[PDB]
Amino acid sequence: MTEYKLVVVGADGVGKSALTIQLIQNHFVDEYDPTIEDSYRKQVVIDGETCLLDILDTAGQAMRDQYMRTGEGFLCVFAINNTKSFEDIHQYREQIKRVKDSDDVPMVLVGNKCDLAARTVESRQAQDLARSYGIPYIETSAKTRQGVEDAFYTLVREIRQH
Ligand SMILES: Nc1nc2c(ncn2[C@@H]2O[C@H](COP(=O)(O)OP(=O)(O)CP(=O)(O)O)[C@@H](O)[C@H]2O)c(=O)[nH]1
Numbered sequence: 001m002t003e004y005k006l007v008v009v010g011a012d013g014v015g016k017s018a019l020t021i022q023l024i025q026n027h028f029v030d031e032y033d034p035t036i037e038d039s040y041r042k043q044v045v046i047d048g049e050t051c052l053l054d055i056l057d058t059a060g061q062a063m064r065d066q067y068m069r070t071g072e073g074f075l076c077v078f079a080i081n082n083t084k085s086f087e088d089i090h091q092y093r094e095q096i097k098r099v100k101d102s103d104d105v106p107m108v109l110v111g112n113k114c115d116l117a118a119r120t121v122e123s124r125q126a127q128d129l130a131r132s133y134g135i136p137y138i139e140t141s142a143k144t145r146q147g148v149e150d151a152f153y154t155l156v157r158e159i160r161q162h
């Protein structure tokens with residue numbers, strides 16, 4: 001079966017761990033346990049083919065270059081009530097682009113915490129950013145599970161079709 005190396009990147013507290021744990025274990029982590037780094041594996045059927053996902057759940061915090069070289073696709077997560085995390089996406093893409101030496105790297109822009117009210121980043125702002133990069137934009141909630149499978153399986157598809 002085909003193996004996919006996915007990397008979940010993004011600023012502190014955006015929900016990188018909650019999204020990964022929701023896809024792997026089907027439950028929401030309510031507490032905030034800051035991540036050093038964890039990796040999870042899951043065997044799933046995507047478009048009739050059995051896939052092995054190896055997902056790297058990174059720290060929001062120089063030591064990011066090693067996983068960017070190995071990573072095949074990147075879930076670039078920001079929280080829709082965290083303007084700085086959305087702005088930080090530009091820096092993550094520039095670093096990934098530099099390490100991979102390529103303008104066409106599989107990525108999906110994810111606006112997490114879509115269950116929360118009073119958003120500070122509009123969907124239109126994130127759609128415009130994703131359009132400038134040529135990548136999909138998907139909103140998610142690790143709390144309700146909305147869009148979680150869609151975000152990861154859209155990224156698997158982006159890698160498979162690269
Ligand atoms: N309302 C809501 N809260 C969420 C959502 N996803 C994560 N959270 C909350 O945000 C906080 C941080 O989530 P966490 O998954 O640890 O984020 P992270 O980006 O992995 C944190 P670090 O960067 O330190 O690893 C937690 O309290 C968690 O429950 C979401 O979709 N909705």
Ligand SMILES: CN(C)Cc1[nH]c2ccccc2c1[C@H]1NC(=O)c2ccc(O)cc21
Nearest residue numbers: 005006007037039054055056066067070071
């Ligand atoms: C092999 N797996 C059990 C772990 C794992 N899953 C991944 C998914 C995407 C990208 C990288 C990885 C890795 C590691 N392989 C690396 O090259 C690397 C660099 C820095 C790290 O922190 C971790 C890894």
Ligand SMILES: [Mg+2]
Nearest residue numbers: 016017034035
């Ligand atoms: Mg985390």
Ligand SMILES: [Mg+2]
Nearest residue numbers: 120121122125
């Ligand atoms: Mg504006």
